[PDB]
CSV table of C-alpha atoms and ligand atoms in Angstrom, one decimal:
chain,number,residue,atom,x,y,z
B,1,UNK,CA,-116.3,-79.6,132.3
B,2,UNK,CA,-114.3,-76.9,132.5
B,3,UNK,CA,-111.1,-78.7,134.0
B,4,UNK,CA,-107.3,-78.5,133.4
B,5,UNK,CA,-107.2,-81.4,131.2
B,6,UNK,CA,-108.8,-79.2,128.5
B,7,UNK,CA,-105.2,-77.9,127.2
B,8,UNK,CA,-105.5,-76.4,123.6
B,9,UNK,CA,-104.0,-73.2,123.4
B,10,UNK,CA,-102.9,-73.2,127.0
B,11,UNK,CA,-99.4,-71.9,127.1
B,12,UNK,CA,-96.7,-72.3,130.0
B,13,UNK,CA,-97.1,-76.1,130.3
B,14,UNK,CA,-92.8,-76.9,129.0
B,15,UNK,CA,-91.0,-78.5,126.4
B,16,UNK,CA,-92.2,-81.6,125.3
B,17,UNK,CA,-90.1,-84.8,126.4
B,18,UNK,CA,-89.7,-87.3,123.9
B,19,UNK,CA,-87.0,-89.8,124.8
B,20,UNK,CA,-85.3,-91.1,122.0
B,21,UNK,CA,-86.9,-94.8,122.6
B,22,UNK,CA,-89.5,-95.9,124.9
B,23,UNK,CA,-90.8,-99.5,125.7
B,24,UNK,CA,-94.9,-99.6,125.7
B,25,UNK,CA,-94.8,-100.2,129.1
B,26,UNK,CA,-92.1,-98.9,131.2
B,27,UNK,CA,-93.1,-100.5,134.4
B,28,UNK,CA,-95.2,-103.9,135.2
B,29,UNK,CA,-97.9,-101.8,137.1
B,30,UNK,CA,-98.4,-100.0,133.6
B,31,UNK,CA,-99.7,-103.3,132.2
B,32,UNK,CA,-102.1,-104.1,134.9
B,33,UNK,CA,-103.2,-100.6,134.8
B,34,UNK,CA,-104.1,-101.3,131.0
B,35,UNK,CA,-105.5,-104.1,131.6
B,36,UNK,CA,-108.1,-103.3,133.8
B,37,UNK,CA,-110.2,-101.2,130.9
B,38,UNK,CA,-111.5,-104.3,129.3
B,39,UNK,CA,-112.0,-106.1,133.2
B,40,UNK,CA,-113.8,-103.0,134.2
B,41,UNK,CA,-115.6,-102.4,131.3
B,42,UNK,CA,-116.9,-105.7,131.1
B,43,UNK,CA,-117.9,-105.4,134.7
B,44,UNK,CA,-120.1,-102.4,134.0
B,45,UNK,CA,-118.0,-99.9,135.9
B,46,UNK,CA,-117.9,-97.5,133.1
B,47,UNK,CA,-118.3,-97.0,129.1
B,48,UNK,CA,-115.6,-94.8,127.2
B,49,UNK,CA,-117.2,-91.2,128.1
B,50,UNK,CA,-117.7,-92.1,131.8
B,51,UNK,CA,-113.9,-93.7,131.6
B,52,UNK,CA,-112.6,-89.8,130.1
B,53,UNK,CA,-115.1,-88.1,133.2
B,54,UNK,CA,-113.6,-89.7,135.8
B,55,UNK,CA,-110.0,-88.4,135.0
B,56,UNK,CA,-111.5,-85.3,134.4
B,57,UNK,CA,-112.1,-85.2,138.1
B,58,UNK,CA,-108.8,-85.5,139.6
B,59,UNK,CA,-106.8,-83.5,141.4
B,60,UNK,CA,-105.7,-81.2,138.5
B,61,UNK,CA,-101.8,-80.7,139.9
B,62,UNK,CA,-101.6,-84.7,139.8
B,63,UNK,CA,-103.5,-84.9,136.5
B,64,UNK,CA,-100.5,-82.7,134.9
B,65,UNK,CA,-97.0,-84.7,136.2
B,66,UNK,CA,-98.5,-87.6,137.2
B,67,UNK,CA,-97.8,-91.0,134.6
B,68,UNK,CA,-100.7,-91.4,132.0
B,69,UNK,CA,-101.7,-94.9,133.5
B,70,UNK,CA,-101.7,-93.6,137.4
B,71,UNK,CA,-105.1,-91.4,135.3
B,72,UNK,CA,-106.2,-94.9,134.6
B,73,UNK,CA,-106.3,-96.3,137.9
B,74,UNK,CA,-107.8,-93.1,139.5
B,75,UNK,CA,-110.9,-93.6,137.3
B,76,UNK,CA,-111.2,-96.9,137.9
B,77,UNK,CA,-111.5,-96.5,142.0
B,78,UNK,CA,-114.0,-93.5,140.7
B,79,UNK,CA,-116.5,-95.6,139.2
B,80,UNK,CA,-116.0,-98.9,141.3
B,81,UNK,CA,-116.4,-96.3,144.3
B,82,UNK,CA,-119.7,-94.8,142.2
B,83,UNK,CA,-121.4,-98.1,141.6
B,84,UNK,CA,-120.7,-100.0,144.8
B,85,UNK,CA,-118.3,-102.5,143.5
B,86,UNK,CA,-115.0,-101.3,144.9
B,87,UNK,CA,-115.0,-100.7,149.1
B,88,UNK,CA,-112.7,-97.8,149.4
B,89,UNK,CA,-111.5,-98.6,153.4
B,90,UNK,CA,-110.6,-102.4,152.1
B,91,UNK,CA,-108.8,-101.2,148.8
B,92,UNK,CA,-107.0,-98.9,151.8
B,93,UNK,CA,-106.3,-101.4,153.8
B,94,UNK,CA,-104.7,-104.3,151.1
B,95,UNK,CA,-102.7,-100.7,149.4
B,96,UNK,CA,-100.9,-101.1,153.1
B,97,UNK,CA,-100.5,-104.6,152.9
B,98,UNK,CA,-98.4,-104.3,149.5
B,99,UNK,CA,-96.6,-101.5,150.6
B,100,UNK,CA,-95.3,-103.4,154.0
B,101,UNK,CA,-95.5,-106.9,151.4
B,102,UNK,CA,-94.8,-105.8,148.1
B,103,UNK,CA,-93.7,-109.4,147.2
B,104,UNK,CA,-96.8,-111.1,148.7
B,105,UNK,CA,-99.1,-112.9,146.1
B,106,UNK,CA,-102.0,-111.9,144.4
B,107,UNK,CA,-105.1,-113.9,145.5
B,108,UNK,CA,-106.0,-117.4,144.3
B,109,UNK,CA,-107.8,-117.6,141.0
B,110,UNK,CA,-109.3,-119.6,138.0
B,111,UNK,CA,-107.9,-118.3,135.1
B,112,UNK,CA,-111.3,-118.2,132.9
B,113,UNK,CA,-110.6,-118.5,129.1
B,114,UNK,CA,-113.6,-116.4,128.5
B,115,UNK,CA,-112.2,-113.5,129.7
B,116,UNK,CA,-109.3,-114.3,127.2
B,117,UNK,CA,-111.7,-114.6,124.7
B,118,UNK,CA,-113.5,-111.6,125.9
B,119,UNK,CA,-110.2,-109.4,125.2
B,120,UNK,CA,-109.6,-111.0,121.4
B,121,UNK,CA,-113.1,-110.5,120.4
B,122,UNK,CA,-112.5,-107.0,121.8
B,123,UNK,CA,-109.1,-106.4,120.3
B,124,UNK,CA,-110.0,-107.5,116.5
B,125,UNK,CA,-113.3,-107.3,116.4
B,126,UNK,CA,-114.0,-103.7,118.2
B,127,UNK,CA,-116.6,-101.6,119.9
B,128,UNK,CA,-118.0,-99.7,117.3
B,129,UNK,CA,-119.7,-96.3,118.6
B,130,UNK,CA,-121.6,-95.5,115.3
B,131,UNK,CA,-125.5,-95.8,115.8
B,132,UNK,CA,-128.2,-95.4,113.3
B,133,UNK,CA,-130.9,-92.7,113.8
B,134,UNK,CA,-134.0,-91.7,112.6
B,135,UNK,CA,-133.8,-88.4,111.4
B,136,UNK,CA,-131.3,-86.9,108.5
B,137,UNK,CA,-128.8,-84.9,109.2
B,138,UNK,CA,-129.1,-81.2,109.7
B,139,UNK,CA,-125.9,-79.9,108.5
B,140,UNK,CA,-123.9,-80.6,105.1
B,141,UNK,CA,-121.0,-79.6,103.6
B,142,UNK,CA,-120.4,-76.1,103.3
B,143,UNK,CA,-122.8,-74.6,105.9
B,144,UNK,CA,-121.1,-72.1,108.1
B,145,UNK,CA,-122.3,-72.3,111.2
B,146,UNK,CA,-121.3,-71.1,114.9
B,147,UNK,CA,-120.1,-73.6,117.9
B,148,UNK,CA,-122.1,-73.5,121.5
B,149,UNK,CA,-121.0,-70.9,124.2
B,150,UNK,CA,-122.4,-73.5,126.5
B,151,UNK,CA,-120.1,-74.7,129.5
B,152,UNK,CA,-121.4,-77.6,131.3
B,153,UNK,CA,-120.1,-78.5,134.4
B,154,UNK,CA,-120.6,-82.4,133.6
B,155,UNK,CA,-118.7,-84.3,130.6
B,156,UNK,CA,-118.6,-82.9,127.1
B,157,UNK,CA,-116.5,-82.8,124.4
B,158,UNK,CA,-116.4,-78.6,124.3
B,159,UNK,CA,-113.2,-77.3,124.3
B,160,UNK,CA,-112.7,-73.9,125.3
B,161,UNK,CA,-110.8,-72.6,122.2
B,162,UNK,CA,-113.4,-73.2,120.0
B,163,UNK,CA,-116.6,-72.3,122.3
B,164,UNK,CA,-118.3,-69.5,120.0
B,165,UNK,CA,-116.4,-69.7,117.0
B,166,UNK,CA,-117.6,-69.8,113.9
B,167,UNK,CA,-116.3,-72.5,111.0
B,168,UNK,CA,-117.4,-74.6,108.3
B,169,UNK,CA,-118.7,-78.2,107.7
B,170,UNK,CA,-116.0,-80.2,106.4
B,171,UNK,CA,-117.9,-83.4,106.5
B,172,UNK,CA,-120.8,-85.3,108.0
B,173,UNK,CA,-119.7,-88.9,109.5
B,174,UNK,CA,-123.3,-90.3,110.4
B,175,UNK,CA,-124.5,-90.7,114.2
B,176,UNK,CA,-122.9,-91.1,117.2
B,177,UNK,CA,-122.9,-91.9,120.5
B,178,UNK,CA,-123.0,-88.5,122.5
B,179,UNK,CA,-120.6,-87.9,125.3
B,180,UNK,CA,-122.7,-85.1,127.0
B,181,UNK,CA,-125.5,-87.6,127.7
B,182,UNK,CA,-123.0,-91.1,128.1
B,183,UNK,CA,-120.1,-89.6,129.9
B,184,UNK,CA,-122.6,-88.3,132.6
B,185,UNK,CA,-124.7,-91.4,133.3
B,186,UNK,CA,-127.6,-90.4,130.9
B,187,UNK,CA,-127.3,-93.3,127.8
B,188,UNK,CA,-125.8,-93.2,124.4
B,189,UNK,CA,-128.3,-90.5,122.8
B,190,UNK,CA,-127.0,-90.9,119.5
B,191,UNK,CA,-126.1,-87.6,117.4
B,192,UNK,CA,-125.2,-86.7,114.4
B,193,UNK,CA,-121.4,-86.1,114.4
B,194,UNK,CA,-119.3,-83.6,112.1
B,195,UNK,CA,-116.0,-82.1,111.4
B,196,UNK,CA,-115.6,-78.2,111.2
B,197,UNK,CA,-112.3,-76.3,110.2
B,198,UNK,CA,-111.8,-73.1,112.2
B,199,UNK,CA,-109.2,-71.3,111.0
B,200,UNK,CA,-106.3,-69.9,113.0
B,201,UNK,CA,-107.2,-66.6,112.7
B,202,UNK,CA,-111.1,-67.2,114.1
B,203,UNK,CA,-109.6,-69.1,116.7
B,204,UNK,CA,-106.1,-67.2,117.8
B,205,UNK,CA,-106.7,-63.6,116.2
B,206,UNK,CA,-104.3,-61.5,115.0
B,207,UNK,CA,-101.5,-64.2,116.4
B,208,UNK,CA,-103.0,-66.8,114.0
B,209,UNK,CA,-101.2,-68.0,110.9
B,210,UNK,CA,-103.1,-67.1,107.8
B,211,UNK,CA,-102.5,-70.8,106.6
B,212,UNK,CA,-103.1,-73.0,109.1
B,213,UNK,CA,-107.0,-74.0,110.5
B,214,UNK,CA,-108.1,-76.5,112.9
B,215,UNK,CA,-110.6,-79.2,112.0
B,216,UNK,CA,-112.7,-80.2,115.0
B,217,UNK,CA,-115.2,-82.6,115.4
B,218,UNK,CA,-119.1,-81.3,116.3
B,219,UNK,CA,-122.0,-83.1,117.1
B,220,UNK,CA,-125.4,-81.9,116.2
B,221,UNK,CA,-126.3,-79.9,119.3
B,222,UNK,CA,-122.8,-78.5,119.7
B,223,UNK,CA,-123.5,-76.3,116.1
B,224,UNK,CA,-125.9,-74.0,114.6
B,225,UNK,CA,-126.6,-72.4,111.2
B,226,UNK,CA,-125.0,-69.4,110.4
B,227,UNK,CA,-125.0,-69.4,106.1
B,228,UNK,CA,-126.4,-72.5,104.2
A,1,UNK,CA,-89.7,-79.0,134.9
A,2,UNK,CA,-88.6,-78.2,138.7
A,3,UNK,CA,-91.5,-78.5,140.8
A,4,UNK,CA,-90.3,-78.1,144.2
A,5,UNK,CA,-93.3,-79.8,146.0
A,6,UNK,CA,-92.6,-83.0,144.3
A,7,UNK,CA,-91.5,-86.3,145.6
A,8,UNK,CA,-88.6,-88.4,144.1
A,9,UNK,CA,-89.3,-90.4,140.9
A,10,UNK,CA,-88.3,-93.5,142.9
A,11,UNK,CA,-90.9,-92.7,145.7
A,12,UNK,CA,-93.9,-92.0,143.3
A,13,UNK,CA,-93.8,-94.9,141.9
A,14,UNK,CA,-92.7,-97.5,144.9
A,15,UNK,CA,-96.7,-95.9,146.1
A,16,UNK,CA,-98.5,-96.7,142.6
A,17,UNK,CA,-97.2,-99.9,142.6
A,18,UNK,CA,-98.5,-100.8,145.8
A,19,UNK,CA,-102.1,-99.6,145.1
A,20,UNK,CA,-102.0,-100.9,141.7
A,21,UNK,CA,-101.4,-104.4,143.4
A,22,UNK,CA,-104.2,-103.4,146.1
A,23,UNK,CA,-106.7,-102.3,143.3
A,24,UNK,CA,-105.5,-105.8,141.0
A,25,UNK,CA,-105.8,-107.8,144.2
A,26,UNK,CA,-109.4,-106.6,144.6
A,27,UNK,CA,-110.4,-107.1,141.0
A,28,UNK,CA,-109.1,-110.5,141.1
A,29,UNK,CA,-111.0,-111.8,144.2
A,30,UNK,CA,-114.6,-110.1,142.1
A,31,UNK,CA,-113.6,-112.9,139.7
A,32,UNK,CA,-113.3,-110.0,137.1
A,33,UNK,CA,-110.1,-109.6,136.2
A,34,UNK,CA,-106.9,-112.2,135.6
A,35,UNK,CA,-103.6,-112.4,135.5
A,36,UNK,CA,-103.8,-114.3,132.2
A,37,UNK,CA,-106.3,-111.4,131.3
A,38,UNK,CA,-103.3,-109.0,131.8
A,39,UNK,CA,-100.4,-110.8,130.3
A,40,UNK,CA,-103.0,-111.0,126.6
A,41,UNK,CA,-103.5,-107.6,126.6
A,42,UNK,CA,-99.7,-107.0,127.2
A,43,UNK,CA,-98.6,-109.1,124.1
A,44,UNK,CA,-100.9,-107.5,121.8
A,45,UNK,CA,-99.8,-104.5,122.3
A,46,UNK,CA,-96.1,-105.4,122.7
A,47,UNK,CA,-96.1,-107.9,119.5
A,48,UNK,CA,-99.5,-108.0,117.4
A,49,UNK,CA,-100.4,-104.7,117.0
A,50,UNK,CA,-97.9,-101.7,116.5
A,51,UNK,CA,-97.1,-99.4,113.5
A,52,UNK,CA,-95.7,-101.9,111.0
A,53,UNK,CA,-99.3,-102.7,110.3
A,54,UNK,CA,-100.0,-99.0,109.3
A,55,UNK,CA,-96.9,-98.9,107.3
A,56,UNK,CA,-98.8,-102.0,105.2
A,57,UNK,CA,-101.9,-99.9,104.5
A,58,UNK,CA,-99.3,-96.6,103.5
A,59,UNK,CA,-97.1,-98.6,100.9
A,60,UNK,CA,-99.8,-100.3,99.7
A,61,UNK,CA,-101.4,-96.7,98.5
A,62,UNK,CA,-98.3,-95.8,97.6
A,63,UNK,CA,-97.9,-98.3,95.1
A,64,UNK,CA,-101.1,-99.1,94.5
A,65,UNK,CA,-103.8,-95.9,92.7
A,66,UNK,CA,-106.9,-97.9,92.9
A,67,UNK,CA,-106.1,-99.0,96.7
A,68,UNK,CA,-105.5,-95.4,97.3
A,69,UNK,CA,-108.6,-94.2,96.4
A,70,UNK,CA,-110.5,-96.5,98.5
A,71,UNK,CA,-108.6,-95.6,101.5
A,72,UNK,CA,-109.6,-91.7,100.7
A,73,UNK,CA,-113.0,-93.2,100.5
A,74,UNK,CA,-113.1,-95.4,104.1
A,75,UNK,CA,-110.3,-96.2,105.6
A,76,UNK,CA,-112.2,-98.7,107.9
A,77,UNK,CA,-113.2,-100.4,105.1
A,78,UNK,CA,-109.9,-100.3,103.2
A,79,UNK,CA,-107.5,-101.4,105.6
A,80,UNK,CA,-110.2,-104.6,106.3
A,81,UNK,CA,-109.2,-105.6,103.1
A,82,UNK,CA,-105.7,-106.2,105.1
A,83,UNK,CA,-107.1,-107.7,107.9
A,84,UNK,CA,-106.0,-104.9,110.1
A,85,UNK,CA,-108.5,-103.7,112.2
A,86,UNK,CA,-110.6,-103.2,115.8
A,87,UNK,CA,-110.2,-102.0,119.2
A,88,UNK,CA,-110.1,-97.8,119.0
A,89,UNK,CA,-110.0,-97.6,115.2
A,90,UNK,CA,-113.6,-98.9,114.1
A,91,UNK,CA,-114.0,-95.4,112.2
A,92,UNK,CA,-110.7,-94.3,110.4
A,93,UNK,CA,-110.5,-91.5,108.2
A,94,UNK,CA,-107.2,-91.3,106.3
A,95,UNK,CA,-106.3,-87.9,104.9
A,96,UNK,CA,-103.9,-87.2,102.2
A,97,UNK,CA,-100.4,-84.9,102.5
A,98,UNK,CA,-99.6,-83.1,99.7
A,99,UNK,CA,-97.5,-80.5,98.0
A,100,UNK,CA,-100.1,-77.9,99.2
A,101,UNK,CA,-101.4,-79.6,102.2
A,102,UNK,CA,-99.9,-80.9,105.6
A,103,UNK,CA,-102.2,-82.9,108.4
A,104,UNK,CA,-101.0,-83.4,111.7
A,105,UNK,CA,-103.3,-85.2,114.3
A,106,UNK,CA,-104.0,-84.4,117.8
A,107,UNK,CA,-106.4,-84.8,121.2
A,108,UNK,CA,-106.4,-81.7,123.0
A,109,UNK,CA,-109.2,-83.1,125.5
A,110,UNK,CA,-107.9,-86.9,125.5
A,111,UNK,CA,-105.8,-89.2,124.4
A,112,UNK,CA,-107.7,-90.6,121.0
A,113,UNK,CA,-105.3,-92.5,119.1
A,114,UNK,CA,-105.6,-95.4,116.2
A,115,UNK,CA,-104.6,-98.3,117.9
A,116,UNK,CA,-105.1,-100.9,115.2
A,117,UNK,CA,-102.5,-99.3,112.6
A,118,UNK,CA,-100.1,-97.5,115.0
A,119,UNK,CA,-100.3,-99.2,118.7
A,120,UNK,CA,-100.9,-97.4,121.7
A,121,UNK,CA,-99.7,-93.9,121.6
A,122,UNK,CA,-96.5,-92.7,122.3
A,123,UNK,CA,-96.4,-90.8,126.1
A,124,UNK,CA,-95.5,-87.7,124.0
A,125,UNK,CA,-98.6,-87.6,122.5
A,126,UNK,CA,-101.0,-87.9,125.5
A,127,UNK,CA,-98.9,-85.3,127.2
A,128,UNK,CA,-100.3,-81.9,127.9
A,129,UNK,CA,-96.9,-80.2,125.9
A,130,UNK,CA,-98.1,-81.0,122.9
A,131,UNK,CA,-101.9,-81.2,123.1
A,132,UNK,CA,-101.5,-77.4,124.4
A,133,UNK,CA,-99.7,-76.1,121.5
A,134,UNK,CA,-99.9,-77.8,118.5
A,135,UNK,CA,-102.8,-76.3,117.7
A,136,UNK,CA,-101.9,-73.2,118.1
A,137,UNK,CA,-98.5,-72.9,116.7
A,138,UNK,CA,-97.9,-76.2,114.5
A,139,UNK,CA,-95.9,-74.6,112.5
A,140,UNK,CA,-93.2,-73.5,115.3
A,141,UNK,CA,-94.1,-77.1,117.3
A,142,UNK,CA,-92.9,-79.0,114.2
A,143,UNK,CA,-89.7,-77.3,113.7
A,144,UNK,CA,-88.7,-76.7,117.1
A,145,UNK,CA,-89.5,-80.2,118.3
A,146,UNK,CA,-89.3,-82.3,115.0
A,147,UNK,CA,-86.8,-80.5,112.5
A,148,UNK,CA,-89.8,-80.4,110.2
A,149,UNK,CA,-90.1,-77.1,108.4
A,150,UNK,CA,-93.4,-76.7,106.8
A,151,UNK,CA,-92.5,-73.6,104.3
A,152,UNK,CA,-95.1,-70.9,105.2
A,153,UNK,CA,-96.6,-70.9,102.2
A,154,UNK,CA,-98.0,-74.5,102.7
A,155,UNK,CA,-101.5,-74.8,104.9
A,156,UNK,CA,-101.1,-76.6,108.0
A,157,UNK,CA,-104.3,-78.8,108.7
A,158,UNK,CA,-104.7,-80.1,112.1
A,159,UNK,CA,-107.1,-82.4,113.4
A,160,UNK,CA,-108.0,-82.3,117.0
A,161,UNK,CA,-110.0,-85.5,117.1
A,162,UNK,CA,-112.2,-86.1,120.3
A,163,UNK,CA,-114.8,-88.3,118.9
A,164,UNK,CA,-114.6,-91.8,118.1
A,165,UNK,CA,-113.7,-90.7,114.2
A,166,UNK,CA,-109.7,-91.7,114.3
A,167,UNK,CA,-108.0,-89.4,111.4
A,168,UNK,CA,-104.6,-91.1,110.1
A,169,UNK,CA,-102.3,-89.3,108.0
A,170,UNK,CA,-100.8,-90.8,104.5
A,171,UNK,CA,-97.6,-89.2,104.1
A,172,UNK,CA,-96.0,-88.3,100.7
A,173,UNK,CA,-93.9,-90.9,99.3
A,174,UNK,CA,-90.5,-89.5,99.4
A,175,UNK,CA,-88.5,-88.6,96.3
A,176,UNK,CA,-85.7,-91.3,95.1
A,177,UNK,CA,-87.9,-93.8,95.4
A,178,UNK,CA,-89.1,-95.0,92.2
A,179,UNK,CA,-89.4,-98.2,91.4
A,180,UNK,CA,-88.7,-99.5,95.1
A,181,UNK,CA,-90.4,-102.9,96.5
A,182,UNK,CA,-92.8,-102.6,99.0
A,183,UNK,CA,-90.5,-104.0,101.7
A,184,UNK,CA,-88.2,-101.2,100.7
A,185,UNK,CA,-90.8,-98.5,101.5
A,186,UNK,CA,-92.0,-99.9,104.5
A,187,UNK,CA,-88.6,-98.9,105.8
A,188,UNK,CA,-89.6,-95.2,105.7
A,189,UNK,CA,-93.0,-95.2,107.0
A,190,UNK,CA,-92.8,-94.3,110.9
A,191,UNK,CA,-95.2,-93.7,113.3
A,192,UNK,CA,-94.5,-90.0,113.2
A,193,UNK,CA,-95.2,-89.9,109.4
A,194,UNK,CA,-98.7,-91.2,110.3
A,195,UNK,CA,-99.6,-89.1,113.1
A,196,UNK,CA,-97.8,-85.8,110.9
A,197,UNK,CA,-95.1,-84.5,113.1
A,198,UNK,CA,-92.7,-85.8,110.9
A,199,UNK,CA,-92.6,-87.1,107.1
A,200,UNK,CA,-91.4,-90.2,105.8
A,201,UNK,CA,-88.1,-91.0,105.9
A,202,UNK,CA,-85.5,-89.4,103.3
A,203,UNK,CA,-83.2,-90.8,101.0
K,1,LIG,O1,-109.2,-85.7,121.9
């Protein structure tokens, strides 16, 4: 997509604010909103591409002040709202009840070690997103090649600043899970994935420091050839 | 920055907690999610898993040549041999400063971070300020925000990482330091050092 949240090189956005010392979470909502990934996930309202998409889709004034964990909880009614799970007047309906009860309880539940156990093996253990293909890869080392002018409306990982610029394979990583077929509902459609420095110049023009280059990560379909 | 269609601080967030606790309440009743489920997560990444265990994997390649090289050489595999681990860094790459060559690591599109070495991001990082310019000015960004100069001479290498590849950067072991015990070191190995908008500590 071509949305707001695709920030390189955009200018006019203000100072960054870095306060000296920050807790993890700086409000107990933030820690439910975290919590839900793994819940949600494990639920099949979403993989990690379709998780990025839906923020991608929000209102793109709220997406810039708006805290990072509110982006959480939009995409989560997203995709519950997308695969039936979540009832969007009832979720309006109990959001009144907590604002006239905020001290109410939550309902009644079993609290089911294996979703405890579900969120260690998760933690330590990890998702992995590598896959193994069938074909070698295409690129190596070297090659110079050009990124796509393409600019789908649907998930991908293109950002504008690089869209037609021409670089050089820094290394291949093996295969990947795609986000241009995952994010958008289509499967995993593994890829071979690579990292291509750009330098400033290519990428900035004449504004571009003549030391400084930007390595950016490409899978197959996002490159072609330019010189072996 | 003044925005003057904005509600109060105090009002935005008396509204996201109640439709968090709407949304929770809902997920609770689908038997999917827990409030035990909620409090784990929240102590591993309050207490288990921050940026002390990334200042391990540095010290030990700083003290350590034939360590080193196998971190260059997979840094998934290397920092196994630590037991550290998991959840959003399955696939680290760890790249080297030097005295010719400064990384610094960003997520212009997202918010890709290696959790198991450094915890969750800082909100800093997942910001829009700093996805927007660092990579196209790093060299300003890290001396108007950090106090880092990077002479001009030196080449500025910055990742913008939106796959699942998570790049860490091993600083430069600062000078005065010979001879130092690992504990010691640790002491200058920060967060910042390992994401590059800083070095390691001085003195
Ligand atoms: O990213």
């Amino acid at each position: 997509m071509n949305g707001v949240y695709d920030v390189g090189g955009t200018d006019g956005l203000g100072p960054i604010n870095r306060p000296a010392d920050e807790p993890v979470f700086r409000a107990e909502w933030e820690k439910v909103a975290f919590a839900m990934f793994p819940a949600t996930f494990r639920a099949g309202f979403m993989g990690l591409d379709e998780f990025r998409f839906g923020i991608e889709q929000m209102n793109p004034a709220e997406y810039l002040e708006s805290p990072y964990y509110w982006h959480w909880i939009r995409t989560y009614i997203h995709h519950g709202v997308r695969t039936g799970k979540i009832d969007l007047e009832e979720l309006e309906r109990r959001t009144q009840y907590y604002r006239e009860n905020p001290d109410a309880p939550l309902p009644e539940h079993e609290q089911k070690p294996e979703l405890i156990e579900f969120v260690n093996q998760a933690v330590y253990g990890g998702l992995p997103a590598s896959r193994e293909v069938d074909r070698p890869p295409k690129f190596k080392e070297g090659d110079v090649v050009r990124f796509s002018t393409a600019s789908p409306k649907g998930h991908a990982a293109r950002a504008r600043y690089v869209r037609g610029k021409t670089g050089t394979v820094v290394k291949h990583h093996g295969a990947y899970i795609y986000p241009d077929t995952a994010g958008n509902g289509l499967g995993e459609c593994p890829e071979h994935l690579y990292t291509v420095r750009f330098t400033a110049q290519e990428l900035w023009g004449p504004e571009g420091d003549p030391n400084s280059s930007v390595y950016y990560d490409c899978w197959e379909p996002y490159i072609e050839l330019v010189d072996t | 920055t003044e925005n003057i269609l904005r509600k109060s601080d105090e009002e935005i967030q008396k509204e996201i907690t109640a439709r968090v606790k709407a949304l929770e309440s809902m997920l609770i009743e689908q038997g999917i999610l827990t409030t035990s489920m909620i409090d784990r997560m929240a102590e591993i990444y309050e207490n288990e898993v921050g940026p002390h265990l990334g200042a391990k994997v540095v010290v030990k390649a700083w003290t350590d040549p034939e360590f080193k090289k196998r971190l260059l050489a997979d840094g998934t595999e290397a920092c196994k041999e630590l037991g550290i681990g998991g959840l959003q860094g399955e696939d680290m790459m760890w790249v080297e400063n030097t005295d010719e060559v400064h990384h610094v690591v960003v997520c212009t599109l997202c918010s890709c971070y290696p959790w198991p070495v450094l915890g969750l991001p800082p909100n800093w990082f997942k910001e829009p300020q700093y996805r927007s310019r660092v990579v196209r000015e790093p060299r300003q960004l890290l001396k108007e925000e950090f106090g880092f100069e990077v002479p001009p001479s030196k080449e500025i290498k910055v990742w913008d990482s939106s796959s699942e590849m998570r790049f860490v950067v091993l600083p430069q072991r600062p000078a005065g330091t010979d001879g130092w015990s690992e504990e010691e070191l640790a002491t200058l190995v920060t967060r910042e050092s390992m994401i590059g908008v800083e070095p390691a500590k001085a003195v």
